[PDB]
């Protein structure tokens, strides 16, 4: 079934964080607003509603989340560890890091900006989008990436983690170090 | 060897200490409506795990929070009350914490006996050759 | 090493996130009373063989003194 207004109230804390862990909810109403953090870990939710607003961070670790629609506003970070997300939509306003470890993610939006750290660890992604900007640490360990785009920006450390990079960006300014 | 018993039993001594501290924080936060970190505390549990990697030490793999819904109480005049007027309190269950308190103490003390038992065997093994 | 054939100890706890459909968490089939007895039996039997091995060396040492 689907979450109602009264069922929403029974999964909210004092400061306004929605906890849906292991709960049997399949879809959320459109134009959904959360006062604080949102947790949809281990949920059978396969799609996030259009116009979704989260006043905190989105937690979807080891969930069945697959599709996020554009226009979603997230003030905190996005944690989609172990979910079933295959692509990242364009135009997501993310106020924090993006953790996509152990996901079937294949494609990323062009010129994506991550205000925090980025993770593509053990993902089947084949190539990073052109003009990528990362303000934190980039972990690509165990992924299928082997060629970086012509231009990219990482303001922290770059962790190869084991994968072999052969074509480095022509224009790259690094605020940290590169680790294998 | 008999020294591996000390590593295995010693790991359980630390393991049961983690669960005791987690229970202590649960008992002390059973009536705390507010919390720094913008999160209404929820009951935490230490999930043990055998690290097979003969001798199988026990390791704490991380603390996990309770899945029970928070206890909602209608307190309309509280500053933390929502529009409907309900304030939410942690889902700490007193009875399970008391049961965890007993089990953690009983398991902690029986690991001391095994370490003591292995100590005597090593001392006798050293008396051979003298 | 062989695992025991005793059925796992089932506990009703629809709160642990690692539970199942019926709210059951299965726990190891370890019996404390049989572990205490094994601890007593293992320690005593281990130290008994220390005495036999230690006394065996004495017999070997006395053999070297034959004819002296």
């Amino acid at each position: 079934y689907e979450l109602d207004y009264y069922s929403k109230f029974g999964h909210t804390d004092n400061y306004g964080n929605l906890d849906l862990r292991n709960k049997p909810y399949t879809q959320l109403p459109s134009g959904f607003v959360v006062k604080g953090n949102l947790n949809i870990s281990q949920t059978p939710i396969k799609k996030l509603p259009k116009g979704l607003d989260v006043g905190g961070s989105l937690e979807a670790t080891n969930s069945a989340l697959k599709t996020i629609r554009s226009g979603t506003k997230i003030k905190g970070y996005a944690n989609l560890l172990g979910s079933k997300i295959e692509s990242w939509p364009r135009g997501i306003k993310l106020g924090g890091y993006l953790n996509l470890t152990d996901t079937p993610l294949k494609t990323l939006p062009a010129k994506l900006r991550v205000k925090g750290d980025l993770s593509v660890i053990r993902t089947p992604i084949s190539a990073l989008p052109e003009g990528l900007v990362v303000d934190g640490n980039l972990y690509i360990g165990g992924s299928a990436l082997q060629v970086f785009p012509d231009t990219m920006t990482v303001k922290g450390n770059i962790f190869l983690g084991g994968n072999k990079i052969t074509k480095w960006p022509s224009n790259l300014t690094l605020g940290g170090a590169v680790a294998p | 060897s008999l020294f591996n018993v000390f590593n295995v039993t010693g790991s359980a001594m630390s393991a049961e200490s983690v669960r005791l501290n987690t229970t202590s924080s649960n008992l002390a936060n059973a009536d705390s409506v507010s919390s720094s970190a913008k999160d209404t505390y929820k009951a935490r549990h230490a999930v043990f795990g055998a690290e097979l990697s003969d001798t199988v030490p026990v390791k704490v793999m991380g603390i996990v929070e309770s899945d029970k819904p928070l206890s909602a109480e209608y307190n309309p005049d509280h500053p933390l009350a929502n529009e409907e007027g309900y304030i939410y309190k942690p889902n700490v269950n007193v009875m399970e914490e008391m049961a965890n308190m007993i089990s953690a103490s009983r398991a902690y003390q029986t690991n001391v006996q095994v370490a003591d038992s292995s100590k005597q065997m090593l001392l006798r093994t050293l008396q051979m050759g003298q | 090493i062989v695992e025991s054939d005793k059925p796992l100890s089932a506990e009703y706890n629809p709160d642990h996130p690692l539970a199942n459909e019926e709210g059951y968490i299965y726990k190891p089939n370890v019996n404390v009373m049989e572990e205490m007895a094994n601890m007593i039996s293992a320690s005593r039997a281990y130290q008994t063989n220390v005495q036999v091995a230690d006394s065996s060396k004495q017999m070997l040492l006395r053999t070297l003194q034959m004819g002296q």
Binding site: G82, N99, D117, R122, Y139 | - | -
Partner: peptide
């Protein structure tokens, strides 16, 4: 890995991925 919902002891920062927990 192991448990899927372990916590993190580091203070919230919302910008750095917590490496305290086994994030795999």
């Amino acid at each position: 890995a192991g448990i899927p919902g372990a916590l993190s002891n580091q203070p919230p920062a919302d910008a750095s991925i917590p490496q305290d927990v086994a994030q795999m």
